[PDB]
Structure formats: structure tokens, C-alpha cells
Amino acid sequence: ADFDAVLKCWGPVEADYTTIGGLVLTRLFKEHPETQKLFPKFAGIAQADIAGNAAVSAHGATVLKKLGELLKAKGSHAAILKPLANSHATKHKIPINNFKLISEVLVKVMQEKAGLDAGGQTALRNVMGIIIADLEANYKELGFS
Numbered sequence: 001a002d003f004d005a006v007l008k009c010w011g012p013v014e015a016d017y018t019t020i021g022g023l024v025l026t027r028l029f030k031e032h033p034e035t036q037k038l039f040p041k042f043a044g045i046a047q048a049d050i051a052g053n054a055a056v057s058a059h060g061a062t063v064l065k066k067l068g069e070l071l072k073a074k075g076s077h078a079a080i081l082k083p084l085a086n087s088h089a090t091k092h093k094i095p096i097n098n099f100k101l102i103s104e105v106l107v108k109v110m111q112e113k114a115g116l117d118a119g120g121q122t123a124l125r126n127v128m129g130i131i132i133a134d135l136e137a138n139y140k141e142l143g144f145s
């Protein structure tokens with residue numbers, strides 16, 4: 001049910017993954033500046049110059065597309081989340097807490113831009129908790145606690 005609750009508000013996100021993806025990453029870097037170092041292509045870009053940056057928005061679109069694809073799966077997601085854990089632990093080297101941060105940002109963006117109400121905000125935090133716990137369990141399998 002919590003996946004359905006989020007998907008009933010995903011339309012505005014999927015409608016413009018570039019704009020919303022750019023909003024999410026811009027906000028992440030503004031509110032959690034230490035995360036920007038984790039993107040070597042973007043690390044060091046002055047904050048005022050991120051909202052207008054097409055490459056930032058394009059990567060935000062990649063992130064949100066994958067998250068959509070996953071949702072739409074409604075928890076039967078292994079062929080999906082295992083590769084993502086693998087690349088994020090071993091290639092991008094993203095500590096697991098950062099996924100909690102981007103999920104806090106996405107809740108806010110969806111509240112403001114996608115009509116996500118109080119119950120939907122809870123549903124999204126629950127679904128992101130499912131995703132993050134699975135990423136964490138796969139990180140552990142790889143040696144990353």
C-alpha cells in the first residue's frame with residue numbers, strides 16, 4: 001500500500017525528471033554540502049551555480065528514473081537493488097547515510113511539487129526505508145558496514 005500511495009503522486013516527478021531531478025540534487029547540495037564531494041563531477045561547483053546546471057539536472061533525472069522503475073516494482077526489486085548497492089558501495093563509494101539524506105530531500109520536494117500529503121510523506125519515508133535497508137544489507141555482503 002505504501003508504494004501505491006507514493007505512485008499516486010509520482011506523475012509530476014515522471015512528467016519532468018530533469019527539472020525535479022535538478023531540484024533534488026540542488027537541494028541536497030545546499031542542505032547537506034558534504035554530499036557534493038561524493039560526486040567528483042560536481043564537487044567544487046559554487047552553490048549558486050548548481051540550480052541552472054544541466055548536467056546536475058541530468059544526473060538527478062537518472063536517479064529519479066531508477067527510483068521510479070523500482071517503485072513501480074512495489075518491493076519485488078532484487079534485480080534492481082542489488083546492482084545499485086554494488087555500484088554505490090564499490091564504484092561511487094557512497095556511505096549509506098547519504099541515502100537517508102536524499103530521501104529527506106525528496107519527501108520535501110514531493111510535498112512542495114507533487115501534492116504528496118501527510119500520509120503520502122509517511123508512505124514515502126517507509127518505502128525509502130525499505131530501499132535503504134536493502135542497500136545496507138547488500139553493502140554488508142560486500143564488506144561495507
Ligand code: HEM
Binds near residue numbers: 062083094
Ligand atoms: C535511492 C537513491 C538513489 C538512486 C536511485 C540512485 C541511482 C543512480 C543511478 C541509476 C546511477 C547510474 C548507474 C548505476 O549505478 O547503476 C547513479 C550514479 C551515481 N550516484 Fe546514485 N542514486 C541514489 C542516491 C545517491 C546518493 C545518495 C549519492 C550521493 C550522495 C549518489 C551518488 C551517485 C554518483 C556519484 C554516481 C555516479 C555519477 C556519474 O558517474 O556520472 N547516488 N545513481
